[PDB]
């Protein structure tokens, strides 16, 4: 069933990451580890083969190449702290591949966003899609942006000419419970 999860037409933003539930089906993670297409194939708590768990979750989103290192237990940064946090005892795999040819636009893509401000860090597997104005100062914002009142989401602006570290990457996080 992975065919429609990896080769999907459009992925979700990292702040609004999508979760697909996969329970008891056909799977062969041997053709994925052997693939140079996947820039990242790293598993935690299990070594990358044909074991058995009751359920599989497929979390998918898009970030940039420099941020793929944050999709791992015990990491800090924009993505790990404000967008997608993996627990320390995470048991699963993280898979990523360069999606520049799909998610990058000349002049910048406006469809993929990431949370820029948040007063506290996300709990593991917490999903925050609120668009409340971030109050950075003591003075309360009343829904209007300004000094110390910033919009919490920012656009990646993916461009094909960007450095590979700033190019879009589609990430799939498989967790086994």
């Amino acid at each position: 069933p992975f065919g429609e999860v990896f080769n999907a037409t459009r992925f979700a933003s990292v702040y609004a990451w999508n979760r697909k539930r996969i329970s008891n089906c056909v799977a062969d993670y041997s053709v994925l580890y052997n693939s140079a297409s996947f820039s990242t194939f790293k598993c935690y708590g299990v070594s990358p083969n044909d074991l058995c768990f009751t359920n599989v979750y497929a979390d998918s989103f898009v970030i940039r190449g420099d941020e793929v290192r944050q999709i791992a237990p015990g990491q800090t940064g924009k993505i790990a702290d404000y967008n997608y946090k993996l627990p320390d005892d995470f048991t699963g795999c993280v898979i990523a591949w360069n999606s520049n040819n799909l998610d990058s636009k000349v002049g910048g893509n406006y469809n993929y966003l990431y949370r820029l401000f948040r007063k506290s860090n996300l709990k593991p597997f917490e999903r925050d899609i609120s668009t409340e104005i971030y109050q950075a100062g003591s003075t309360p914002c009343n829904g209007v942006e300004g000094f110390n009142c910033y919009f919490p989401l920012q656009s990646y602006g993916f461009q094909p000419t960007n450095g590979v570290g700033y190019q879009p990457y589609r990430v799939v996080v498989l967790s086994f419970e």
């Epitope: 820029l116 950075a136 100062g137 003591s138 300004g146 000094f147 110390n148 910033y150």
Partner: antibody, heavy 123, light 109 residues
């Protein structure tokens, strides 16, 4: 040492461009903002524009919309002010100002200021 | 834009008196987004008061601030010799963040 250090003095010919630097220290640059103000010798303070360090979003004054672009680089904790097509009227001292902030909250005004950068434009 | 006008132009006062400076806005501005600055010759502006009535860090308590909407005040209870400089008011609520034209506080003689 909550500091804001600017570039050295500049002397350019008319029709060229100058890029003044402004580097932060002490506070966490990533969550503050930096405004730019110019002052001609013996004149008042003129607000040029500001930038939000995290997003890079800018707002400029009407009179600088045409020749000033403000940028920042969070890696080098520095904000810049590019001034294209210089002329004698641009001969002034330029200041950078920012609120100091920790990782989540900010001061409620522009309390940190740079030393100032004098830009001389003539032939 | 919001025009900020200051008065008086020059404040000629003796050391030890009480200074009073005014800052007017062309339209009502939020009190929490107005500041006062002090600038001495050859130096950068220094923040004194913000939020109309909130003393900055390190500023002496003889510096006070009041006002609301279109009219704001910077009161100096007892003027010290290190206080004779130029004073500016800036609103940073509505863009652009306009400045006032300044008030010179000189030692009267």
């Amino acid at each position: 040492q909550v500091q804001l250090v600017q570039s050295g003095p500049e002397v350019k010919k008319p029709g060229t461009s100058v890029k003044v630097s402004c580097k932060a220290s002490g506070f966490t640059f990533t969550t503050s903002a930096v405004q730019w103000v110019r002052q001609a010798r013996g004149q008042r303070l003129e607000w040029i524009g500001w930038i939000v360090v995290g997003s890079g979003n800018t707002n400029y004054a009407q009179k600088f919309q045409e020749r000033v672009t403000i940028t920042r680089d969070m890696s080098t904790t520095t904000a810049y002010m590019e001034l294209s097509s210089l002329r004698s009227e641009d001969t002034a001292v330029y200041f950078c100002a920012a609120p100091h902030c920790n990782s989540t909250s900010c001061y409620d005004a522009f309390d940190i200021w740079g030393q100032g950068t004098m830009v001389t434009v003539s032939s | 834009d919001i025009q900020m006008t200051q008065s008086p132009g020059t404040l000629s006062l003796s050391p030890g008196e009480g200074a009073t400076l005014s800052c007017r806005a062309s339209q009502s501005v939020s009190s929490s987004y107005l500041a006062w600055y002090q600038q001495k010759p050859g130096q950068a502006p220094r923040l004194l008061i913000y939020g109309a009535s909130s003393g900055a860090t390190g500023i002496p308590d003889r510096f006070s601030g009041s006002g609301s909407g279109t009219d704001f005040t910077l009161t100096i209870s007892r003027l010290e010799p290190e206080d004779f400089a130029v004073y500016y008011c800036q609103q940073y609520g509505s863009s652009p963040y306009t400045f006032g034209q300044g008030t010179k506080v000189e030692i009267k003689r």
